[PDB]
Amino acid sequence: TAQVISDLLAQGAELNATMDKTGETSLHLAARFARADAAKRLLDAGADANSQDNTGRTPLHAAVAADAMGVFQILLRNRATNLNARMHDGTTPLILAARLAIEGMVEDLITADADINAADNSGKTALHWAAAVNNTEAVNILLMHHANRDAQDDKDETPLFLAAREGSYEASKALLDNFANREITDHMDRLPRDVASERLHHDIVRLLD
Ligand SMILES: [Mg+2]
């Protein structure tokens, strides 16, 4: 016990330089550097699974961003872990997994019952983001689990609108095949077809037609 505590305090001191710049805790680092072993030790030592760093990330956000599947599962099995924790900009772990295209975690968070329709501060859901970066796999998983397909962000943009706007051909087709409404316009009455045409995304324009 003395050995465990003394080590934690010693390691903590050597890592404070880093943590003072990021606002992270030892658990954040375990997640960021993918150390499943260290992650368990810290949680058993009483580490707060929901502590936030300078951008509002909890160790769960960190695990997703670093694709630390081990630490991720260790956090998911921890009942105190808030799966819907929000970064300062409103980003949840599921939104991060979709936007960063981290494999496996989109399905895991959904299965673990994370709020599938949560949106960041710009009104964008995990589905909005998956569409924007053409993470077609996440788009299909989200849709299979009934994510709101026609959800609109603060600019009234639907995921289909973003896929058209950002040139995500595969994601656009996936949304259309799942009956996303292509007639829902943004705050400027622009159709997904309009923004695609304006940006010369002819392939997506044909798709919408
Ligand atoms: Mg899995």
Side-chain angles (χ1 to χ4, degrees), residues 141-193:
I141 290 172
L142 286 164
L143 291 176
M144 183 181 272
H145 290 276
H146 310 298
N148 194 300
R149 76 174 73 76
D150 291 326
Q152 294 177 89
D153 60 21
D154 295 350
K155 288 183 170 60
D156 294 329
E157 308 169 312
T158 59
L160 175 60
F161 185 87
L162 296 187
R165 182 184 202 273
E166 305 310 332
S168 297
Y169 182 79
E170 292 70 21
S172 296
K173 182 184 183 301
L175 284 160
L176 289 169
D177 290 340
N178 277 281
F179 314 93
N181 192 334
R182 61 245 275 172
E183 299 299 359
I184 298 178
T185 65
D186 71 354
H187 63 153
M188 295 298 282
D189 271 58
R190 280 176 294 176
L191 286 164
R193 186 185 191 292

mmCIF file of all heavy atoms in Angstrom, residues 141-193:
data_model
loop_
_atom_site.group_PDB
_atom_site.id
_atom_site.type_symbol
_atom_site.label_atom_id
_atom_site.label_comp_id
_atom_site.label_asym_id
_atom_site.label_seq_id
_atom_site.Cartn_x
_atom_site.Cartn_y
_atom_site.Cartn_z
ATOM 1 N N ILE A 141 -23.867 2.622 -38.894
ATOM 2 C CA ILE A 141 -24.077 2.087 -37.555
ATOM 3 C C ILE A 141 -25.078 2.984 -36.820
ATOM 4 O O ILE A 141 -26.024 2.498 -36.189
ATOM 5 C CB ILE A 141 -22.750 2.029 -36.763
ATOM 6 C CG1 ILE A 141 -21.843 0.953 -37.357
ATOM 7 C CG2 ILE A 141 -23.028 1.756 -35.285
ATOM 8 C CD1 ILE A 141 -20.434 0.948 -36.784
ATOM 9 N N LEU A 142 -24.879 4.295 -36.916
ATOM 10 C CA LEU A 142 -25.774 5.241 -36.260
ATOM 11 C C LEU A 142 -27.205 5.090 -36.776
ATOM 12 O O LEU A 142 -28.165 5.081 -35.994
ATOM 13 C CB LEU A 142 -25.263 6.678 -36.466
ATOM 14 C CG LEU A 142 -24.026 7.024 -35.623
ATOM 15 C CD1 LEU A 142 -23.345 8.290 -36.146
ATOM 16 C CD2 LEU A 142 -24.451 7.210 -34.160
ATOM 17 N N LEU A 143 -27.349 4.953 -38.091
ATOM 18 C CA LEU A 143 -28.664 4.796 -38.694
ATOM 19 C C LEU A 143 -29.311 3.458 -38.319
ATOM 20 O O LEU A 143 -30.521 3.378 -38.122
ATOM 21 C CB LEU A 143 -28.568 4.915 -40.221
ATOM 22 C CG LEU A 143 -28.233 6.320 -40.738
ATOM 23 C CD1 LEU A 143 -28.075 6.293 -42.254
ATOM 24 C CD2 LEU A 143 -29.338 7.289 -40.337
ATOM 25 N N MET A 144 -28.496 2.409 -38.224
ATOM 26 C CA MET A 144 -29.021 1.093 -37.865
ATOM 27 C C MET A 144 -29.634 1.154 -36.467
ATOM 28 O O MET A 144 -30.642 0.496 -36.190
ATOM 29 C CB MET A 144 -27.905 0.047 -37.895
ATOM 30 C CG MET A 144 -28.380 -1.367 -37.596
ATOM 31 S SD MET A 144 -27.033 -2.559 -37.626
ATOM 32 C CE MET A 144 -27.016 -3.002 -39.379
ATOM 33 N N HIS A 145 -29.028 1.961 -35.603
ATOM 34 C CA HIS A 145 -29.495 2.127 -34.235
ATOM 35 C C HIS A 145 -30.470 3.291 -34.065
ATOM 36 O O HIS A 145 -30.638 3.830 -32.973
ATOM 37 C CB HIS A 145 -28.292 2.274 -33.303
ATOM 38 C CG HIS A 145 -27.504 1.010 -33.154
ATOM 39 N ND1 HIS A 145 -27.853 0.017 -32.263
ATOM 40 C CD2 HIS A 145 -26.428 0.543 -33.835
ATOM 41 C CE1 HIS A 145 -27.029 -1.007 -32.401
ATOM 42 N NE2 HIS A 145 -26.156 -0.715 -33.349
ATOM 43 N N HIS A 146 -31.098 3.683 -35.172
ATOM 44 C CA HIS A 146 -32.114 4.725 -35.179
ATOM 45 C C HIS A 146 -31.740 6.149 -34.779
ATOM 46 O O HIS A 146 -32.552 6.849 -34.173
ATOM 47 C CB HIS A 146 -33.301 4.258 -34.334
ATOM 48 C CG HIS A 146 -33.778 2.884 -34.689
ATOM 49 N ND1 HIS A 146 -34.271 2.567 -35.937
ATOM 50 C CD2 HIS A 146 -33.806 1.737 -33.970
ATOM 51 C CE1 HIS A 146 -34.583 1.284 -35.971
ATOM 52 N NE2 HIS A 146 -34.310 0.757 -34.791
ATOM 53 N N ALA A 147 -30.522 6.585 -35.104
ATOM 54 C CA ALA A 147 -30.140 7.960 -34.804
ATOM 55 C C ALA A 147 -31.081 8.824 -35.657
ATOM 56 O O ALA A 147 -31.438 8.435 -36.771
ATOM 57 C CB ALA A 147 -28.691 8.208 -35.197
ATOM 58 N N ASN A 148 -31.491 9.978 -35.138
ATOM 59 C CA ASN A 148 -32.390 10.858 -35.881
ATOM 60 C C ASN A 148 -31.723 11.282 -37.190
ATOM 61 O O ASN A 148 -30.834 12.138 -37.202
ATOM 62 C CB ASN A 148 -32.742 12.090 -35.044
ATOM 63 C CG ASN A 148 -33.915 12.858 -35.619
ATOM 64 O OD1 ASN A 148 -33.870 13.326 -36.758
ATOM 65 N ND2 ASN A 148 -34.981 12.985 -34.835
ATOM 66 N N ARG A 149 -32.172 10.686 -38.289
ATOM 67 C CA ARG A 149 -31.600 10.936 -39.609
ATOM 68 C C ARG A 149 -31.782 12.335 -40.196
ATOM 69 O O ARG A 149 -30.939 12.790 -40.978
ATOM 70 C CB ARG A 149 -32.134 9.903 -40.603
ATOM 71 C CG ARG A 149 -33.553 10.155 -41.062
ATOM 72 C CD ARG A 149 -33.943 9.170 -42.149
ATOM 73 N NE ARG A 149 -34.148 7.830 -41.614
ATOM 74 C CZ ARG A 149 -35.222 7.464 -40.924
ATOM 75 N NH1 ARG A 149 -36.185 8.343 -40.691
ATOM 76 N NH2 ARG A 149 -35.332 6.225 -40.461
ATOM 77 N N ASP A 150 -32.874 13.012 -39.844
ATOM 78 C CA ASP A 150 -33.115 14.353 -40.363
ATOM 79 C C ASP A 150 -32.829 15.451 -39.347
ATOM 80 O O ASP A 150 -33.292 16.577 -39.511
ATOM 81 C CB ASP A 150 -34.559 14.499 -40.861
ATOM 82 C CG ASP A 150 -34.840 13.675 -42.105
ATOM 83 O OD1 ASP A 150 -33.930 13.523 -42.949
ATOM 84 O OD2 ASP A 150 -35.982 13.194 -42.250
ATOM 85 N N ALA A 151 -32.060 15.134 -38.309
ATOM 86 C CA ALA A 151 -31.736 16.127 -37.286
ATOM 87 C C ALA A 151 -31.091 17.358 -37.926
ATOM 88 O O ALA A 151 -30.292 17.232 -38.856
ATOM 89 C CB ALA A 151 -30.794 15.522 -36.251
ATOM 90 N N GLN A 152 -31.442 18.543 -37.434
ATOM 91 C CA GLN A 152 -30.888 19.791 -37.968
ATOM 92 C C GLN A 152 -30.016 20.528 -36.943
ATOM 93 O O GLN A 152 -30.379 20.626 -35.765
ATOM 94 C CB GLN A 152 -32.018 20.715 -38.445
ATOM 95 C CG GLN A 152 -32.805 20.172 -39.638
ATOM 96 C CD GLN A 152 -33.973 21.065 -40.040
ATOM 97 O OE1 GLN A 152 -33.827 21.992 -40.851
ATOM 98 N NE2 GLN A 152 -35.139 20.795 -39.465
ATOM 99 N N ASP A 153 -28.865 21.038 -37.380
ATOM 100 C CA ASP A 153 -28.004 21.770 -36.461
ATOM 101 C C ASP A 153 -28.490 23.217 -36.317
ATOM 102 O O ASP A 153 -29.579 23.559 -36.786
ATOM 103 C CB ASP A 153 -26.538 21.731 -36.912
ATOM 104 C CG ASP A 153 -26.312 22.351 -38.281
ATOM 105 O OD1 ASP A 153 -27.139 23.165 -38.746
ATOM 106 O OD2 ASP A 153 -25.278 22.019 -38.885
ATOM 107 N N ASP A 154 -27.695 24.065 -35.670
ATOM 108 C CA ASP A 154 -28.096 25.453 -35.460
ATOM 109 C C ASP A 154 -28.339 26.235 -36.750
ATOM 110 O O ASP A 154 -29.027 27.253 -36.731
ATOM 111 C CB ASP A 154 -27.061 26.181 -34.595
ATOM 112 C CG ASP A 154 -26.988 25.624 -33.181
ATOM 113 O OD1 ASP A 154 -27.865 24.805 -32.815
ATOM 114 O OD2 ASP A 154 -26.061 26.003 -32.431
ATOM 115 N N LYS A 155 -27.782 25.766 -37.865
ATOM 116 C CA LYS A 155 -27.973 26.431 -39.154
ATOM 117 C C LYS A 155 -28.985 25.647 -39.981
ATOM 118 O O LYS A 155 -29.059 25.798 -41.206
ATOM 119 C CB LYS A 155 -26.654 26.515 -39.923
ATOM 120 C CG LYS A 155 -25.653 27.513 -39.366
ATOM 121 C CD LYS A 155 -24.407 27.564 -40.240
ATOM 122 C CE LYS A 155 -23.494 28.721 -39.847
ATOM 123 N NZ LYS A 155 -23.028 28.623 -38.433
ATOM 124 N N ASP A 156 -29.768 24.812 -39.296
ATOM 125 C CA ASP A 156 -30.788 23.968 -39.914
ATOM 126 C C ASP A 156 -30.246 23.005 -40.961
ATOM 127 O O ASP A 156 -30.975 22.570 -41.853
ATOM 128 C CB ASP A 156 -31.901 24.818 -40.521
ATOM 129 C CG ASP A 156 -32.692 25.567 -39.467
ATOM 130 O OD1 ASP A 156 -32.817 25.041 -38.341
ATOM 131 O OD2 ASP A 156 -33.195 26.670 -39.767
ATOM 132 N N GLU A 157 -28.968 22.666 -40.843
ATOM 133 C CA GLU A 157 -28.343 21.734 -41.774
ATOM 134 C C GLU A 157 -28.572 20.303 -41.275
ATOM 135 O O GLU A 157 -28.403 20.011 -40.086
ATOM 136 C CB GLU A 157 -26.833 21.990 -41.863
ATOM 137 C CG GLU A 157 -26.456 23.430 -42.156
ATOM 138 C CD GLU A 157 -24.974 23.690 -41.963
ATOM 139 O OE1 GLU A 157 -24.427 23.284 -40.913
ATOM 140 O OE2 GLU A 157 -24.356 24.305 -42.853
ATOM 141 N N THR A 158 -28.963 19.420 -42.183
ATOM 142 C CA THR A 158 -29.171 18.019 -41.849
ATOM 143 C C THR A 158 -27.853 17.312 -42.153
ATOM 144 O O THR A 158 -26.956 17.894 -42.779
ATOM 145 C CB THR A 158 -30.239 17.391 -42.743
ATOM 146 O OG1 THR A 158 -29.822 17.498 -44.111
ATOM 147 C CG2 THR A 158 -31.576 18.099 -42.564
ATOM 148 N N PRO A 159 -27.704 16.057 -41.698
ATOM 149 C CA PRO A 159 -26.468 15.326 -41.975
ATOM 150 C C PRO A 159 -26.261 15.233 -43.491
ATOM 151 O O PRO A 159 -25.143 15.353 -43.973
ATOM 152 C CB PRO A 159 -26.725 13.962 -41.334
ATOM 153 C CG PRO A 159 -27.555 14.330 -40.132
ATOM 154 C CD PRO A 159 -28.538 15.330 -40.718
ATOM 155 N N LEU A 160 -27.350 15.033 -44.241
ATOM 156 C CA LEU A 160 -27.254 14.933 -45.701
ATOM 157 C C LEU A 160 -26.729 16.236 -46.292
ATOM 158 O O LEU A 160 -25.937 16.226 -47.234
ATOM 159 C CB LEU A 160 -28.617 14.608 -46.319
ATOM 160 C CG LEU A 160 -28.694 14.582 -47.856
ATOM 161 C CD1 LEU A 160 -27.742 13.540 -48.406
ATOM 162 C CD2 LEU A 160 -30.120 14.277 -48.302
ATOM 163 N N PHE A 161 -27.178 17.362 -45.740
ATOM 164 C CA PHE A 161 -26.722 18.668 -46.213
ATOM 165 C C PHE A 161 -25.208 18.776 -46.014
ATOM 166 O O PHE A 161 -24.492 19.232 -46.905
ATOM 167 C CB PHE A 161 -27.406 19.802 -45.445
ATOM 168 C CG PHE A 161 -27.067 21.176 -45.969
ATOM 169 C CD1 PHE A 161 -27.804 21.741 -47.005
ATOM 170 C CD2 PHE A 161 -25.991 21.893 -45.438
ATOM 171 C CE1 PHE A 161 -27.479 23.008 -47.512
ATOM 172 C CE2 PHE A 161 -25.657 23.161 -45.939
ATOM 173 C CZ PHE A 161 -26.406 23.714 -46.976
ATOM 174 N N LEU A 162 -24.721 18.352 -44.849
ATOM 175 C CA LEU A 162 -23.291 18.425 -44.570
ATOM 176 C C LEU A 162 -22.473 17.493 -45.464
ATOM 177 O O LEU A 162 -21.373 17.848 -45.883
ATOM 178 C CB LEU A 162 -22.997 18.103 -43.099
ATOM 179 C CG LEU A 162 -23.550 19.050 -42.025
ATOM 180 C CD1 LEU A 162 -22.993 18.622 -40.663
ATOM 181 C CD2 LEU A 162 -23.144 20.501 -42.331
ATOM 182 N N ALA A 163 -23.005 16.302 -45.749
ATOM 183 C CA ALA A 163 -22.294 15.352 -46.607
ATOM 184 C C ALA A 163 -22.178 15.950 -48.010
ATOM 185 O O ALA A 163 -21.162 15.782 -48.686
ATOM 186 C CB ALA A 163 -23.042 14.012 -46.653
ATOM 187 N N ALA A 164 -23.226 16.640 -48.443
ATOM 188 C CA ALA A 164 -23.242 17.271 -49.759
ATOM 189 C C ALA A 164 -22.281 18.455 -49.768
ATOM 190 O O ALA A 164 -21.546 18.669 -50.728
ATOM 191 C CB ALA A 164 -24.663 17.750 -50.101
ATOM 192 N N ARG A 165 -22.290 19.213 -48.686
ATOM 193 C CA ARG A 165 -21.441 20.389 -48.539
ATOM 194 C C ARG A 165 -19.957 20.041 -48.451
ATOM 195 O O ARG A 165 -19.110 20.740 -49.013
ATOM 196 C CB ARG A 165 -21.853 21.151 -47.276
ATOM 197 C CG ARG A 165 -21.096 22.450 -47.004
ATOM 198 C CD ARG A 165 -21.556 23.035 -45.667
ATOM 199 N NE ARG A 165 -21.300 24.470 -45.559
ATOM 200 C CZ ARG A 165 -20.168 25.018 -45.124
ATOM 201 N NH1 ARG A 165 -19.152 24.255 -44.740
ATOM 202 N NH2 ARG A 165 -20.059 26.342 -45.065
ATOM 203 N N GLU A 166 -19.647 18.962 -47.743
ATOM 204 C CA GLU A 166 -18.263 18.579 -47.550
ATOM 205 C C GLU A 166 -17.735 17.525 -48.516
ATOM 206 O O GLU A 166 -16.642 16.999 -48.321
ATOM 207 C CB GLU A 166 -18.044 18.120 -46.106
ATOM 208 C CG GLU A 166 -18.478 19.147 -45.049
ATOM 209 C CD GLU A 166 -17.916 20.553 -45.292
ATOM 210 O OE1 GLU A 166 -16.831 20.682 -45.903
ATOM 211 O OE2 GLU A 166 -18.554 21.536 -44.851
ATOM 212 N N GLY A 167 -18.503 17.224 -49.558
ATOM 213 C CA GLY A 167 -18.061 16.249 -50.542
ATOM 214 C C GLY A 167 -17.825 14.850 -49.998
ATOM 215 O O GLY A 167 -16.734 14.292 -50.143
ATOM 216 N N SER A 168 -18.855 14.285 -49.373
ATOM 217 C CA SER A 168 -18.792 12.935 -48.806
ATOM 218 C C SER A 168 -19.773 12.096 -49.613
ATOM 219 O O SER A 168 -20.917 11.897 -49.212
ATOM 220 C CB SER A 168 -19.208 12.962 -47.330
ATOM 221 O OG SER A 168 -18.310 13.756 -46.576
ATOM 222 N N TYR A 169 -19.319 11.618 -50.764
ATOM 223 C CA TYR A 169 -20.175 10.840 -51.641
ATOM 224 C C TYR A 169 -20.759 9.586 -50.995
ATOM 225 O O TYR A 169 -21.972 9.381 -51.027
ATOM 226 C CB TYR A 169 -19.415 10.466 -52.921
ATOM 227 C CG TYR A 169 -20.262 9.701 -53.910
ATOM 228 C CD1 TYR A 169 -21.171 10.362 -54.734
ATOM 229 C CD2 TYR A 169 -20.191 8.314 -53.987
ATOM 230 C CE1 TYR A 169 -21.997 9.658 -55.615
ATOM 231 C CE2 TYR A 169 -21.001 7.601 -54.859
ATOM 232 C CZ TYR A 169 -21.904 8.277 -55.670
ATOM 233 O OH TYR A 169 -22.705 7.568 -56.534
ATOM 234 N N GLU A 170 -19.907 8.760 -50.400
ATOM 235 C CA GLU A 170 -20.368 7.524 -49.775
ATOM 236 C C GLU A 170 -21.372 7.779 -48.646
ATOM 237 O O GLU A 170 -22.379 7.076 -48.526
ATOM 238 C CB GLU A 170 -19.178 6.717 -49.245
ATOM 239 C CG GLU A 170 -18.239 6.131 -50.317
ATOM 240 C CD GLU A 170 -17.400 7.180 -51.048
ATOM 241 O OE1 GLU A 170 -17.219 8.295 -50.514
ATOM 242 O OE2 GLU A 170 -16.904 6.880 -52.159
ATOM 243 N N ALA A 171 -21.108 8.792 -47.825
ATOM 244 C CA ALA A 171 -22.008 9.116 -46.720
ATOM 245 C C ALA A 171 -23.344 9.628 -47.245
ATOM 246 O O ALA A 171 -24.400 9.316 -46.685
ATOM 247 C CB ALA A 171 -21.365 10.155 -45.805
ATOM 248 N N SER A 172 -23.305 10.408 -48.323
ATOM 249 C CA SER A 172 -24.538 10.942 -48.916
ATOM 250 C C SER A 172 -25.431 9.808 -49.400
ATOM 251 O O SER A 172 -26.639 9.819 -49.180
ATOM 252 C CB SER A 172 -24.220 11.869 -50.096
ATOM 253 O OG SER A 172 -23.499 13.019 -49.667
ATOM 254 N N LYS A 173 -24.832 8.829 -50.068
ATOM 255 C CA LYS A 173 -25.593 7.696 -50.577
ATOM 256 C C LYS A 173 -26.202 6.887 -49.434
ATOM 257 O O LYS A 173 -27.347 6.438 -49.522
ATOM 258 C CB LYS A 173 -24.692 6.791 -51.418
ATOM 259 C CG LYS A 173 -25.419 5.601 -52.024
ATOM 260 C CD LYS A 173 -24.457 4.692 -52.774
ATOM 261 C CE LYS A 173 -25.204 3.541 -53.441
ATOM 262 N NZ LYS A 173 -25.953 2.702 -52.458
ATOM 263 N N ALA A 174 -25.431 6.703 -48.366
ATOM 264 C CA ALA A 174 -25.889 5.949 -47.200
ATOM 265 C C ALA A 174 -27.114 6.618 -46.580
ATOM 266 O O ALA A 174 -28.083 5.949 -46.209
ATOM 267 C CB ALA A 174 -24.762 5.843 -46.166
ATOM 268 N N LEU A 175 -27.068 7.941 -46.460
ATOM 269 C CA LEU A 175 -28.191 8.674 -45.892
ATOM 270 C C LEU A 175 -29.414 8.585 -46.804
ATOM 271 O O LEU A 175 -30.530 8.360 -46.335
ATOM 272 C CB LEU A 175 -27.795 10.134 -45.657
ATOM 273 C CG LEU A 175 -26.894 10.331 -44.433
ATOM 274 C CD1 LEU A 175 -26.143 11.656 -44.514
ATOM 275 C CD2 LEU A 175 -27.749 10.259 -43.170
ATOM 276 N N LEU A 176 -29.200 8.750 -48.106
ATOM 277 C CA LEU A 176 -30.292 8.681 -49.071
ATOM 278 C C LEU A 176 -30.936 7.291 -49.091
ATOM 279 O O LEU A 176 -32.164 7.171 -49.131
ATOM 280 C CB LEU A 176 -29.780 9.059 -50.469
ATOM 281 C CG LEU A 176 -29.448 10.549 -50.653
ATOM 282 C CD1 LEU A 176 -28.706 10.772 -51.968
ATOM 283 C CD2 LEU A 176 -30.734 11.358 -50.624
ATOM 284 N N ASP A 177 -30.111 6.245 -49.059
ATOM 285 C CA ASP A 177 -30.627 4.877 -49.058
ATOM 286 C C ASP A 177 -31.458 4.622 -47.805
ATOM 287 O O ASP A 177 -32.261 3.690 -47.761
ATOM 288 C CB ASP A 177 -29.486 3.855 -49.107
ATOM 289 C CG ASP A 177 -28.768 3.842 -50.439
ATOM 290 O OD1 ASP A 177 -29.352 4.311 -51.438
ATOM 291 O OD2 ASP A 177 -27.623 3.347 -50.491
ATOM 292 N N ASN A 178 -31.255 5.445 -46.782
ATOM 293 C CA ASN A 178 -31.996 5.299 -45.535
ATOM 294 C C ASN A 178 -33.105 6.328 -45.420
ATOM 295 O O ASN A 178 -33.575 6.644 -44.324
ATOM 296 C CB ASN A 178 -31.036 5.369 -44.350
ATOM 297 C CG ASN A 178 -30.363 4.039 -44.066
ATOM 298 O OD1 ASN A 178 -30.959 3.148 -43.454
ATOM 299 N ND2 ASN A 178 -29.124 3.886 -44.528
ATOM 300 N N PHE A 179 -33.512 6.844 -46.577
ATOM 301 C CA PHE A 179 -34.596 7.808 -46.708
ATOM 302 C C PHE A 179 -34.445 9.178 -46.047
ATOM 303 O O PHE A 179 -35.435 9.781 -45.622
ATOM 304 C CB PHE A 179 -35.907 7.161 -46.252
ATOM 305 C CG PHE A 179 -36.122 5.780 -46.806
ATOM 306 C CD1 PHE A 179 -35.715 4.658 -46.089
ATOM 307 C CD2 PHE A 179 -36.701 5.603 -48.055
ATOM 308 C CE1 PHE A 179 -35.880 3.375 -46.608
ATOM 309 C CE2 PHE A 179 -36.866 4.319 -48.588
ATOM 310 C CZ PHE A 179 -36.454 3.205 -47.860
ATOM 311 N N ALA A 180 -33.217 9.678 -45.958
ATOM 312 C CA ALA A 180 -33.008 11.000 -45.385
ATOM 313 C C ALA A 180 -33.763 11.947 -46.315
ATOM 314 O O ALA A 180 -33.784 11.742 -47.529
ATOM 315 C CB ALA A 180 -31.524 11.346 -45.366
ATOM 316 N N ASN A 181 -34.397 12.969 -45.753
ATOM 317 C CA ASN A 181 -35.152 13.916 -46.566
ATOM 318 C C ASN A 181 -34.231 14.935 -47.241
ATOM 319 O O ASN A 181 -33.695 15.828 -46.587
ATOM 320 C CB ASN A 181 -36.174 14.654 -45.702
ATOM 321 C CG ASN A 181 -37.181 15.424 -46.531
ATOM 322 O OD1 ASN A 181 -36.898 15.812 -47.666
ATOM 323 N ND2 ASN A 181 -38.361 15.660 -45.963
ATOM 324 N N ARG A 182 -34.060 14.805 -48.553
ATOM 325 C CA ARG A 182 -33.204 15.714 -49.312
ATOM 326 C C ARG A 182 -33.802 17.108 -49.538
ATOM 327 O O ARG A 182 -33.111 18.005 -50.020
ATOM 328 C CB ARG A 182 -32.871 15.105 -50.677
ATOM 329 C CG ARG A 182 -34.095 14.862 -51.534
ATOM 330 C CD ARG A 182 -34.300 13.378 -51.786
ATOM 331 N NE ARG A 182 -33.518 12.925 -52.927
ATOM 332 C CZ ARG A 182 -33.383 11.655 -53.294
ATOM 333 N NH1 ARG A 182 -33.973 10.686 -52.605
ATOM 334 N NH2 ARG A 182 -32.666 11.358 -54.367
ATOM 335 N N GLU A 183 -35.079 17.309 -49.178
ATOM 336 C CA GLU A 183 -35.744 18.587 -49.419
ATOM 337 C C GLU A 183 -35.600 19.517 -48.218
ATOM 338 O O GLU A 183 -35.998 20.709 -48.319
ATOM 339 C CB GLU A 183 -37.221 18.365 -49.749
ATOM 340 C CG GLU A 183 -37.461 17.525 -50.992
ATOM 341 C CD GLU A 183 -36.874 18.153 -52.241
ATOM 342 O OE1 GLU A 183 -36.293 19.253 -52.136
ATOM 343 O OE2 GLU A 183 -36.996 17.544 -53.325
ATOM 344 N N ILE A 184 -35.082 19.063 -47.096
ATOM 345 C CA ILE A 184 -34.918 19.915 -45.922
ATOM 346 C C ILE A 184 -33.755 20.875 -46.167
ATOM 347 O O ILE A 184 -32.606 20.457 -46.297
ATOM 348 C CB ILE A 184 -34.648 19.069 -44.653
ATOM 349 C CG1 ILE A 184 -35.854 18.159 -44.375
ATOM 350 C CG2 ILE A 184 -34.371 19.985 -43.468
ATOM 351 C CD1 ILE A 184 -35.691 17.246 -43.166
ATOM 352 N N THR A 185 -34.073 22.165 -46.224
ATOM 353 C CA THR A 185 -33.088 23.209 -46.491
ATOM 354 C C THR A 185 -32.432 23.761 -45.234
ATOM 355 O O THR A 185 -32.919 23.547 -44.122
ATOM 356 C CB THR A 185 -33.741 24.386 -47.238
ATOM 357 O OG1 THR A 185 -34.711 25.012 -46.386
ATOM 358 C CG2 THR A 185 -34.435 23.898 -48.500
ATOM 359 N N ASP A 186 -31.325 24.476 -45.414
ATOM 360 C CA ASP A 186 -30.628 25.068 -44.285
ATOM 361 C C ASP A 186 -31.278 26.410 -43.951
ATOM 362 O O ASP A 186 -32.317 26.752 -44.514
ATOM 363 C CB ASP A 186 -29.131 25.240 -44.593
ATOM 364 C CG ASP A 186 -28.848 26.341 -45.607
ATOM 365 O OD1 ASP A 186 -29.803 26.914 -46.180
ATOM 366 O OD2 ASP A 186 -27.650 26.627 -45.828
ATOM 367 N N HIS A 187 -30.671 27.168 -43.042
ATOM 368 C CA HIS A 187 -31.233 28.455 -42.637
ATOM 369 C C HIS A 187 -31.342 29.485 -43.761
ATOM 370 O O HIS A 187 -32.033 30.493 -43.614
ATOM 371 C CB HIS A 187 -30.422 29.056 -41.482
ATOM 372 C CG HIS A 187 -28.998 29.362 -41.834
ATOM 373 N ND1 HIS A 187 -28.270 30.351 -41.200
ATOM 374 C CD2 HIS A 187 -28.157 28.805 -42.739
ATOM 375 C CE1 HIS A 187 -27.050 30.393 -41.706
ATOM 376 N NE2 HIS A 187 -26.956 29.465 -42.641
ATOM 377 N N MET A 188 -30.663 29.235 -44.878
ATOM 378 C CA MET A 188 -30.703 30.152 -46.017
ATOM 379 C C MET A 188 -31.534 29.580 -47.162
ATOM 380 O O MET A 188 -31.397 29.998 -48.313
ATOM 381 C CB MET A 188 -29.284 30.442 -46.515
ATOM 382 C CG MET A 188 -28.401 31.177 -45.518
ATOM 383 S SD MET A 188 -29.050 32.808 -45.104
ATOM 384 C CE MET A 188 -28.550 33.730 -46.556
ATOM 385 N N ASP A 189 -32.398 28.622 -46.837
ATOM 386 C CA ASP A 189 -33.252 27.972 -47.826
ATOM 387 C C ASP A 189 -32.476 27.261 -48.926
ATOM 388 O O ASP A 189 -32.965 27.114 -50.044
ATOM 389 C CB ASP A 189 -34.221 28.976 -48.452
ATOM 390 C CG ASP A 189 -35.513 29.090 -47.675
ATOM 391 O OD1 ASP A 189 -35.457 29.418 -46.472
ATOM 392 O OD2 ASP A 189 -36.586 28.844 -48.265
ATOM 393 N N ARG A 190 -31.265 26.824 -48.603
ATOM 394 C CA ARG A 190 -30.439 26.099 -49.559
ATOM 395 C C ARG A 190 -30.636 24.598 -49.395
ATOM 396 O O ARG A 190 -30.618 24.072 -48.279
ATOM 397 C CB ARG A 190 -28.963 26.439 -49.361
ATOM 398 C CG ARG A 190 -28.539 27.755 -49.986
ATOM 399 C CD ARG A 190 -27.088 28.047 -49.658
ATOM 400 N NE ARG A 190 -26.914 28.285 -48.229
ATOM 401 C CZ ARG A 190 -25.737 28.488 -47.637
ATOM 402 N NH1 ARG A 190 -24.620 28.480 -48.354
ATOM 403 N NH2 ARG A 190 -25.684 28.710 -46.328
ATOM 404 N N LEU A 191 -30.833 23.921 -50.517
ATOM 405 C CA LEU A 191 -31.023 22.478 -50.538
ATOM 406 C C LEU A 191 -29.664 21.806 -50.576
ATOM 407 O O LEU A 191 -28.673 22.416 -50.976
ATOM 408 C CB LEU A 191 -31.791 22.061 -51.794
ATOM 409 C CG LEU A 191 -33.288 22.333 -51.929
ATOM 410 C CD1 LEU A 191 -33.690 22.184 -53.387
ATOM 411 C CD2 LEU A 191 -34.070 21.359 -51.057
ATOM 412 N N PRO A 192 -29.593 20.540 -50.144
ATOM 413 C CA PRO A 192 -28.308 19.842 -50.177
ATOM 414 C C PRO A 192 -27.772 19.918 -51.606
ATOM 415 O O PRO A 192 -26.572 20.067 -51.827
ATOM 416 C CB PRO A 192 -28.688 18.422 -49.781
ATOM 417 C CG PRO A 192 -29.774 18.663 -48.761
ATOM 418 C CD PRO A 192 -30.607 19.753 -49.416
ATOM 419 N N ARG A 193 -28.687 19.833 -52.571
ATOM 420 C CA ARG A 193 -28.339 19.890 -53.983
ATOM 421 C C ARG A 193 -27.747 21.243 -54.360
ATOM 422 O O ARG A 193 -26.886 21.330 -55.232
ATOM 423 C CB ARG A 193 -29.577 19.627 -54.847
ATOM 424 C CG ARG A 193 -29.281 19.524 -56.342
ATOM 425 C CD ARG A 193 -30.561 19.380 -57.155
ATOM 426 N NE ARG A 193 -30.299 19.027 -58.548
ATOM 427 C CZ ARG A 193 -29.716 19.826 -59.440
ATOM 428 N NH1 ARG A 193 -29.327 21.046 -59.095
ATOM 429 N NH2 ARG A 193 -29.520 19.399 -60.681
#
